[PDB]
Design a binder for this molecule. Sequence first.
Ligand SMILES: O=C(O)c1cc(=O)[nH]c(=O)n1[C@@H]1O[C@H](COP(=O)(O)O)[C@@H](O)[C@H]1O
Ligand SMILES: O=C(O)c1cc(=O)[nH]c(=O)n1[C@@H]1O[C@H](COP(=O)(O)O)[C@@H](O)[C@H]1O
Ligand SMILES: [Cl-]
Lengths: 197, 199
Amino acid sequence: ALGPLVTGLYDVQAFKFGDFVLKSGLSSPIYIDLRGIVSRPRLLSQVADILFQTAQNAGISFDTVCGVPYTALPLATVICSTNQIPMLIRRKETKDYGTKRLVEGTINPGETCLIIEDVVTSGSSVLETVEVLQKEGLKVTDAIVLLDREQGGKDKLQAHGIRLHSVCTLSKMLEILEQQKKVDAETVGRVKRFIQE
Amino acid sequence: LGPLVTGLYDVQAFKFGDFVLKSGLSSPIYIDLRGIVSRPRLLSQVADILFQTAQNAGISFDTVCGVPYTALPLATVICSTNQIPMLIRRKETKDYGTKRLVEGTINPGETCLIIEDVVTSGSSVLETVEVLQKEGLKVTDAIVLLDREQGGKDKLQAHGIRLHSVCTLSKMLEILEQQKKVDAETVGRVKRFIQEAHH
Ligand SMILES: O=C(O)c1cc(=O)[nH]c(=O)n1[C@@H]1O[C@H](COP(=O)(O)O)[C@@H](O)[C@H]1O
Ligand SMILES: O=C(O)c1cc(=O)[nH]c(=O)n1[C@@H]1O[C@H](COP(=O)(O)O)[C@@H](O)[C@H]1O
Ligand SMILES: [Cl-]
């Protein structure tokens, strides 16, 4: 069902082309922004559903769910509300200022927390949230992400005991967009070539 | 309403002791809904009651926005359940490299409904209203689960915003007494505190 999902994303302007610098400091000709999904109720639901379905298809076990701040937060909420799962919230809005504790919700050490994320590049953002949760005594083995950019994330997460499960890779997303005439072939070629370097 | 209060009790939402509120006054009671994320059924019920309050008021709006932070998931559930477009206010500490203040599709002149967990002075609601107004949205109404009855309705009215409350602190204390979760002493103590706090 990726074709409709990707089009849906394109139509909330999820795909930005231009010259960007990523969290990891990499230049990129493309930037994928899922903040707009909250403007299209059905699309937000579709994204929540496919994320959850990805976790279920993998056959994994978890007691609770945490979104990586900020864009993934509503996705976690919809998943948890629809499927009746307790949720944890990592509060990042005051960063490391003062001494208030960073994680909201019921933390029962030994329980497994599933991570929900929007886009993974290097993997560092997921891992930062993973470490925070592990330091509270929670077990964390799996992360589900909507878009894997395929820039080292799976391998970096696996090096820390985390299995990355993605709905779609960047290359598959670019292929759908070209097939659907949303982006031209030269842009896809340029974007792929650039990323490779 | 009773069942909703019981759920809130279970997620330890009612704290007693001595607390300084954001408005700088001391209080014998604090209502902390942060634990509601651990009970998705209760979260949904809270979300539904807030939305029904708006619907029974016959107000109209184009989008919905929660006051940071506890209410963010309540707005998300209202919007998800009822298929309403959402805005998210992103409140941080004005550090270097902050991003836009409101996420989602902003159509200037459209009307945004504000959703809140607890109102005391009304200042927290008003801050969010002003951010949305600056971004070009019309705001006329706020729905709050618990109105602590410390001048919120008036403060908000003074800035053109009508506060609708699901429940007041007075009422919630009565329900809590009925359910034998709080004694006839601390009920009086908190009651006395409410008239005191209006000064
Ligand atoms: O900055 C990125 O690398 C990034 C690329 C992109 O296409 N979309 C995007 O949202 N990002 C943001 O950067 C974070 C991922 O970068 P890593 O921490 O390197 O995986 C994600 O959580 C995104 O929020
Ligand atoms: O500090 C409060 O007033 C307050 C009291 C309370 O019982 N529960 C509670 O959550 N608050 C928080 O304080 C703010 C409400 O205070 P005002 O900004 O004065 O209306 C909101 O951010 C509330 O979430
Ligand atoms: Cl949320």
